[PDB]
Amino acid sequence: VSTLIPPKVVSSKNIGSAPNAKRIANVVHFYKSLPQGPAPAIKANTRLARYKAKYFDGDNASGKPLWHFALGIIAFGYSMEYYFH
Amino acid sequence: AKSAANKLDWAKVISSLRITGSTATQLSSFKKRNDEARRQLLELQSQPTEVDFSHY
């Protein structure tokens, strides 16, 4: 009797394995990926984006904006001492 | 001969291992092999069609 037709019916091996699910994710995801990002934000020259550029970089954990920002509040109230005295 | 068909068949049987879709497909190939093996031994068994009018 003639061989049956199972080997040639493939359309439930298109969901049949788990990486089909992953495939339909990364055919979208990686295809819509850019070569490099859009932009990281670091500066924009609003003149305080420069503050971010010098101090608040991705790799700058350096305490300098803190010191500067602290010193700003010291400059503020010290003048206000002379506003009240 | 018949062996050409069957050489491709058994090469395909051990390939059919590499498809799990088979259920009774391998049984259909096995059946064609059975009766194919029957006809060759039938054909080899064969008597001369008619009795010898010379000797017999």
Rounded CA separation B9/B15 (Å): 9
Residue B28 and residue A1 in contact, taking contact as beta carbons nearer than 8 Å: yes
Rounded CA separation A69/B5 (Å): 88
Query: What are the backbone angles phi and psi of residue A61, rounded to the nearest 5°?
Result: -105, 5
For chain B, say whether A58 makes contact (Cβ under 8 Å).
no
Experiment used for this model:
cryo-EM
Token pair recorded at residue B40 = 């060759």
Residue of A1, A2, A6 lying closest to B22 (CB–CB):
A6
Q: Show residues of chain A in contact with B24, CB under 8 Å.
A: 4
Find the Cα–Cα–Cα–Cα dihedral A30, A33, A35, A38, rounded to 10°: -170
Rounded CA separation A10/B26 (Å): 18
Residue B28 and residue A3 in contact, taking contact as beta carbons nearer than 8 Å: yes
To one decimal, the resolution in angstroms is: 3.8
Q: Hey, CA dihedral for A29, A31, A33, A38, is it positive or negative?
A: negative
